[PDB]
Amino acid sequence: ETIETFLDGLASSAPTPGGGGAAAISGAMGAALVSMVCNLTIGKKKYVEVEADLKQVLEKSEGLRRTLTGMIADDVEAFDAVMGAYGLPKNTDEEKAARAAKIQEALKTATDVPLACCRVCREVIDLAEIVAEKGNLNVISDAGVAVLSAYAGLRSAALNVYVNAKGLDDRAFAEERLKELEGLLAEAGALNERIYETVKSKVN
Template sequence: MNFAEISCAEFISRLGSKAPVPGGGGASALVGAVGTALGNMVGALTVGKKKYAEVEGDMIRLREAAEKLQGEFLTLVQRDAEVFEPLSRAYGLPKETEAQREEKDRVMEAALKEACSVPLEIMSKCGEAIRLHEEFAAKGSRLAVSDAGVGAAFCKAALLGASLNVYINTGAMKDRALAGEYNRKADALLAEYGPCSDRIFESVKNYLKKE
């Protein structure tokens, strides 16, 4: 099943069920896609307007980048499911004998590394999307600026959500050096793009409230 292609109703139904996928990582990727699309809408409502002729080129560039990111996020919805399923199976492997325990540890470690890679990529894409929202909010149509603020907030939510999927997997890894490396990457992405999203949101909020 391709989770990027099923209906919203089916995705939500499966997300709220006992099914192992989709989970928090896939949901974060989907939220990132939605947030990015909101910024893209600001661009669409700005392009072609005489009032914003000065930023027409910027909006076209931003929209192209947003379109690409939307597709990448949707791919990551499915990729997250694909990398989690082997991990889910690994948890159920027998561990009655020493050989079984060693095999389970080996399979688990490989699955955990793979399961960290996708949420880290989601976080990186969220950072790219938040940077786009900075420009959408600053240069886009004032009639749609609220959507840039909502988009930035959604991308931050996706960033935070994906980070927890990194940390839950690194917490179970035996290779603590590699776990630390993944954690530091996630920490750095949170530190850089969380405050950036907050600034965009506050700027939009203050503009709308005329403060």
């Protein structure tokens, strides 16, 4: 899909793509920029001490980028399934029961997907940190864009987890997913500002 077409879809009254899709894109760009800093530090003679560490980082970030790029489509199809299920008919007892059950199972999927996106964005913040410490100083600004895009991705997906978890009958499933989410948010809140500041400082 074209960036312009995606953006036209996002802006429209089409329920997909939505915030979940944009979240995965924020994450993917974060993963990509970590990979860029690695690719532009590996080889450089001044940066031999970190080359092996950054080849490992590049390995994981390229992994995270593939996953997060896939997650754009996962969130779109997860949220289409939710709208699908709200649109089933509700004339009879049996239909009302089928509809309610299918809504619940779509909601569950549309909670796990943004939550998965949160986990991968949290890992991108960890790699953003390393390339902020070790990266080629000429391109260090890209480590700062990576952490901001990843943190945007994380808190964007988090809102999707909150709004979906609230509609679930299974309170054990919901409360387990919220507790994980809170810990990912609290960790990322502590690191995001510090990594930005390290980059802001090296930039000036």
